[PDB]
Amino acid sequence: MAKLLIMSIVSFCFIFLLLLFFRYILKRYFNYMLNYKVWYLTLLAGLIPFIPIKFSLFNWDSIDNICTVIWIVLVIILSFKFLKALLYLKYLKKQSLYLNENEKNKIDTILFNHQYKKNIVIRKAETIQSPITFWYGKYIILIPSSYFKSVIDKRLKYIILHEYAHAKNRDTLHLIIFNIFSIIMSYNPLVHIVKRKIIHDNEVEADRFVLNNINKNEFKTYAESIMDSVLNVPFFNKNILSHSANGKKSLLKRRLINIKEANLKKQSKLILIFICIFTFLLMVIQSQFLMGQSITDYNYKKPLHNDYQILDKSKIFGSNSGSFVMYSMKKDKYYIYNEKESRKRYSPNSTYKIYLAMFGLDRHIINDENSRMQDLNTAMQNSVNWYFERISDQIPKNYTATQLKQLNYGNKNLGSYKSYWMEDSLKISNLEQVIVFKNMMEQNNHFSKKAKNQLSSSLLIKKNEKYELYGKTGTGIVNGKYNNGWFVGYVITNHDKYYFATHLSDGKPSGKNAELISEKILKEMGVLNGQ
Amino acid sequence: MAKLLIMSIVSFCFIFLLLLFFRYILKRYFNYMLNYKVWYLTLLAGLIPFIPIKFSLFNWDSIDNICTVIWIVLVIILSFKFLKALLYLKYLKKQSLYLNENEKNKIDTILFNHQYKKNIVIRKAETIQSPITFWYGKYIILIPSSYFKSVIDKRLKYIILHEYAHAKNRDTLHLIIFNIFSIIMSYNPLVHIVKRKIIHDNEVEADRFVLNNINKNEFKTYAESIMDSVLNVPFFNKNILSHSANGKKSLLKRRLINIKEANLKKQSKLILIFICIFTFLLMVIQSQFLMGQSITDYNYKKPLHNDYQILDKSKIFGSNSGSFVMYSMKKDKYYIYNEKESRKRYSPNSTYKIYLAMFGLDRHIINDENSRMQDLNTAMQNSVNWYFERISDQIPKNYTATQLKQLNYGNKNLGSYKSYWMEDSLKISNLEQVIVFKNMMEQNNHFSKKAKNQLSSSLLIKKNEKYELYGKTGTGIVNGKYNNGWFVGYVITNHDKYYFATHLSDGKPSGKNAELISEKILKEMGVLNGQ
Ligand SMILES: [Zn+2]
Ligand SMILES: [Zn+2]
């Protein structure tokens, strides 16, 4: 279904635009114009994707779910508009009177001076405030009874001609048809656009006729007449299914009415003082509503409240440009390569699994005797997503959310995805990654010692006479390409404790390269080399 | 980035709508109105998602790629519009003349009757066709030199007051500001909506002022004056950054101009005969363009050109409602359960792999000695997606496309996904599935015997004294739920050869249930029971 709606719109758009082009030049250079029927052509073009004819010469589900509901909604609504206008007119048909022979004479003169066909019907009523038409298979034409009396300024002459032109061209009907089609074609709002364009042009063609049948010195007053027919009426742009002088929802119209309504009034400044402040408070209330923290959309840029030194490790990053953060527990000092980049937030990928698993451990979901689903050491060493998918399913989401909040987990965005950190909604900077892991063991008072240590052992990479190096990689691979070269970890040495996070964005930003890069950096910096 | 743009729009929308509500009632019941500043409020609300402040009380990549490009595009464009209007005015400023004391007297009277502040500037020129303003930090006010001469109908009195009201309220500037903001805020088309609303209302408030400072019997002519200022001018709605009587792109405007242009002309009927047919041919050309075969979007509904009998197997489907097709090679007859449903097209899921693998065999990509990547029997028996993902990567896509075409593979839609049949773009009915597989072995003359037989052996399910039953399951599991219970296959018996396809849509439409259902049906129908 949706593809048709979509492509129907496409069809329309294309055609429409082509036509408009012609419209553009016909008018611009020659004051010529498209025969409006082309808009049917347009419609038809809009309709024809339908042909179930094989002619030639990603979760998409919602696309159709939406298309289906939107459409049915539109049609009942638009149908309602239709029947109301229809009824108005049909009911009005009941109220439509025949003309006196000495009234009929004028109307007939206007049209049949050109021997126009008589397959139309002329009626009048006191219930007609302004010229209006209907169809009923008869092309019902209606004029104000007051206009039948007021046949002394010949506005009516002009009006009828205008109305006639609509009639010659069967405009009433064309519109009716279009509106009906528009209802089913409503998925394309442009049905109204074109409806409108048509109307505009219908009137233009009418104007052409008018001019075609009048003198050069009448052209002027006609234009004035267009104006009189709007100036002198409320702009009750009511008949959405026909024509009337006031049939347009716009500015001049609004303004003129306000003058009609000019019984001078004063709003207590308080009326608007209240509304404006209230609203402002309501806008403030929108601000109170999750103002969409640009801070959260933005990659982290808060100043590291902690000291620190800026590093230059560009030689090691080399072919895989990125950023890197290291921290000394003894000195409470950070060492940061490309701080602007270090502060950038990226989805954690598989490295988050350490948090997921350790949360399961603290909450007594996952344990040592029952670290299995593989065990935790195997699962972590081989990144077994299955193991971890179950762990998320087995941990109350609120436990996880609580920890995200308590220990400042980046943007703490849990998304809606059970594995939201896996190239999805949760994002964290390298700086934040270091801060959080360090605090996880050093400060977290809502997390057991066993969970801290059990997790730690599963991450050992290498060791020597100075230290034990722990960590975890992950690769942000999307649609087969590398985007996030993650490696995180910590070092326990015989003199200090260090925390760190590496992220590659350029070159081949794989988790493996991040591991290699981090180790090389940490060694050169003394972390893995005794300083 | 995009989230801000999106949510900014949301902000706007909300606020806007709230305001409009008030607008609605203030006007509807009391003829009262929002102080336009609320639209700044709106803007601001639109702007504030920006606050990088954490205040409170799926391939998304494209979302931001798009947001980024769209925005930069919009701003250079809108900036261009701005500078042009600005320049027009600044250049015009160069052309703006001072008034004669005996001209100045009138302008000053109009404003300072109310002791309005004099921090404005009044100028004139022959280059002013209609009233217009600028800012320049001075609130430049411009009137036609002809209006300075034509100070005898007091239109100018009315105009200035109108202009003044804009000035009292610093409208020129407000607009300027908005437009500038609108440029950066352009991602929200509603900036123009509100711009416009503001303008509309700016004029309304001006009208309020006018009325506030005039008599009841002047109100009328003012309205007439609004009209005169539009009636008597080309609607060159040019100054997108200011106000003028003609400053609106609409219908009445277009019509009136055409009258000005009324040097009667006739388009050779051919002008439009050509354009209309050409266009029609262009619409036909759009029809020539992939008319989006609704036939292709639609599930298969072509009549089975072959005979057939309709079945009732609803008892077996039972808890898992669906459809089923069986075919007799000897009789060239089909047996169909719920034909309307049998004809429905579904993505093949893993059952397509038989085609993928056999294509690799014929094209000499995959073979017997080298059926491995697992071998083919293991890969097929355990549905090893990895095996099959590589097979698609290793087969020229055109080979596959050729076979889709030659043997009528449903909608033959290869999508863009290397595994397009795996709950993606390729879809086939059960009827089509039977037709295609049967033809694959029976008719396909662009496919070797070895590929046909090698594939066949890998599908054996069960056998007895009457037959060998072959087939393949697959489960349309999406976001963890079952949607497509596939099982396809064929039977080689000692009396006939049969082909079939089962699909479940309701209950638990798993591949396993489809296997069980198919076998049970085939046995009851005599296929797997000697008849
Ligand atoms: Zn009309
Ligand atoms: Zn104005």
Author numbering:
A (entry chain A), B (entry chain B): 1 to 57, 97 to 412, 428 to 585
Which passages does the manuscript contain on this structure?
BlaR1 and MecR1 are membrane proteins with an N-terminal zinc metalloprotease domain and a C-terminal extracellular β-lactam-binding sensor domain. β-Lactam binding to the extracellular BlaR1 sensor domain regulates BlaI cleavage by the zinc metalloprotease domain in the cytoplasm. BlaR1 forms a domain-swapped dimer, with the zinc metalloprotease active site accessible from the cytoplasm. BlaR1 undergoes spontaneous autocleavage in cis between Ser283 and Phe284 and we describe the catalytic mechanism and specificity underlying the self and BlaI cleavage.
